[PDB]
Amino acid sequence: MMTGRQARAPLQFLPDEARSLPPPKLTDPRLAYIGFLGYCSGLIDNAIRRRPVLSAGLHRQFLYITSFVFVGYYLLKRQDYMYAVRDHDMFSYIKSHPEDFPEKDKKTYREVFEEFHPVR
Amino acid sequence: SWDKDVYPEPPRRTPAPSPQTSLPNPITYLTKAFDLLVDRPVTLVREFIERQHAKNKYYYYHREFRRVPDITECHEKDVLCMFEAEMQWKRDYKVDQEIVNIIQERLKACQQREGESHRQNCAKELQQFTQVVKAYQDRYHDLGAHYSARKCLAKQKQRMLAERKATKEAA
Numbered sequence: 001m002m003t004g005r006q007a008r009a010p011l012q013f014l015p016d017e018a019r020s021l022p023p024p025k026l027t028d029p030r031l032a033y034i035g036f037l038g039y040c041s042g043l044i045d046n047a048i049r050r051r052p053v054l055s056a057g058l059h060r061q062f063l064y065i066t067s068f069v070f071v072g073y074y075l076l077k078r079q080d081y082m083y084a085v086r087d088h089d090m091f092s093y094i095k096s097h098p099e100d101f102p103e104k105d106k107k108t109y110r111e112v113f114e115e116f117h118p119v120r
Numbered sequence: 121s122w123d124k125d126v127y128p129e130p131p132r133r134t135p136a137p138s139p140q141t142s143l144p145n146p147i148t149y150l151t152k153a154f155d156l157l158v159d160r161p162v163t164l165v166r167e168f169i170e171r172q173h174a175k176n177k178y179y180y181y182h183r184e185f186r187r188v189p190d191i192t193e194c195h196e197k198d199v200l201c202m203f204e205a206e207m208q209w210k211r212d213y214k215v216d217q218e219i220v221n222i223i224q225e226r227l228k229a230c231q232q233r234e235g236e237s238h239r240q241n242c243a244k245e246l247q248q249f250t251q252v253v254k255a256y257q258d259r260y261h262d263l264g265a266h267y268s269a270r271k272c273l274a275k276q277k278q279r280m281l282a283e284r285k286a287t288k289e290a291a
Contacts, residue, residue: 108196109196112196113277114270
């Protein structure tokens with residue numbers, strides 16, 4: 001797909017064009033869901049080692065949710081950048097080739113004809 | 121109270137009581153007993169209730185809908201106008217249904233009121249019922265359970281095409 005787009009400057013997580021986009025907020029619902037994933041991971045880690053799942057190792061659960069939030073925030077930044085790239089490339093190709101995307105008329109319903117199929 | 125024009129009723133003619141025999145009918149005595157024992161306390165209670173109502177009077181209004189452009193001036197696949205046309209058509213559909221219900225009420229009231237001579241004295245109500253039923257059937261019938269404004273427009277277009285074909289073949 002966009003492989004040639006990642007041909008001149010490869011192995012870049014976030015290029016110089018990714019910084020012109022608004023960063024995701026710290027109260028993003030997806031970030032909260034990834035933090036909840038980290039909390040679930042901490043609960044499972046306490047459960048599989050025969051520890052009290054809601055009391056044992058609060059620092060472990062804190063590091064779990066912190067690392068999850070960190071990685072999820074960076075992945076969400078990359079996802080937003082890639083979707084912006086997709087939209088920008090699509091609009092640039094639409095603008096560049098007007099003959100391949102010609103406008104169509106918008107006929108009102110007083111002119112267009114629709115066949116009627118009775119239900120009886 | 122209601123509207124005497126949209127819910128008509130012919131003038132009432134009660135014949136006067138002209139008894140022949142000297143036996144007192146119990147209906148007059150029971151009517152007097154009903155007027156004394158029953159009608160007066162109910163009237164007094166309702167008058168007290170209305171007096172309590174008269175201290176605090178508040179109004180409710182009939183909602184008024186302005187006219188929006190219908191489906192015949194909506195572009196193809198433009199939701200922001202066909203939406204309003206669809207909801208206006210739904211409101212008109214409900215209004216038409218209640219109009220037919222009003223005419224049905226008129227017909228049934230005439231048939232019950234005129235008694236054994238109902239076949240002659242209620243011709244106008246029957247003809248109005250027939251006209252409004254013909255209009256409702258030509259406007260809304262056979263649309264289906266998934267009816268919309270576009271289906272009604274297509275049915276109307278088919279109807280005018282058939283009418284044009286019929287009047288062309290007769291001329």
